[PDB]
Design a protein around this ligand. Sequence first.
Ligand SMILES: [Cl-]
Ligand SMILES: [Cl-]
Ligand SMILES: [Cl-]
Ligand SMILES: [Cl-]
Ligand SMILES: [Cl-]
Ligand SMILES: [Cl-]
Ligand SMILES: [Cl-]
Ligand SMILES: [Cl-]
Ligand SMILES: [Cl-]
Ligand SMILES: [Cs+]
Ligand SMILES: [Cs+]
Ligand SMILES: [Cs+]
Ligand SMILES: [Cs+]
Length: 124
Amino acid sequence: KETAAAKFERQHMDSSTSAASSSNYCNQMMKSRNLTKDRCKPVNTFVHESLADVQAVCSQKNVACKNGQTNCYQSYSTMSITDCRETGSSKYPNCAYKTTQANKHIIVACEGNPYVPVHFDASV
Ligand SMILES: [Cl-]
Ligand SMILES: [Cl-]
Ligand SMILES: [Cl-]
Ligand SMILES: [Cl-]
Ligand SMILES: [Cl-]
Ligand SMILES: [Cl-]
Ligand SMILES: [Cl-]
Ligand SMILES: [Cl-]
Ligand SMILES: [Cl-]
Ligand SMILES: [Cs+]
Ligand SMILES: [Cs+]
Ligand SMILES: [Cs+]
Ligand SMILES: [Cs+]
């Protein structure tokens, strides 16, 4: 049902805060964005920038995706991001996440018309 664009927005956009608040940011967000529903999503990154700024990345530096596809774009500037990764104590259905806040260039795969992000590849 969910569009590729809307899935990206749900998993990766958090324009409501400038940066991760607290060590419990990832537990709260991973749950609230429905990323812990049937299993604990092991790794997920949230971007703390406007949706317009993340979308604009699709007309920035064209770079290879890790899988060798050619529709990835690297942000010209660094962006506030939070990486959420499961800890060793994480056991579904009590998922647990480490929160790491950082300022990194993001790399996204773009598709469609409008040409928008559909996958978070990596950050640098
Ligand atoms: Cl959409
Ligand atoms: Cl805002
Ligand atoms: Cl949902
Ligand atoms: Cl999941
Ligand atoms: Cl991710
Ligand atoms: Cl675990
Ligand atoms: Cl859960
Ligand atoms: Cl269209
Ligand atoms: Cl990903
Ligand atoms: Cs920001
Ligand atoms: Cs914690
Ligand atoms: Cs929710
Ligand atoms: Cs391209």
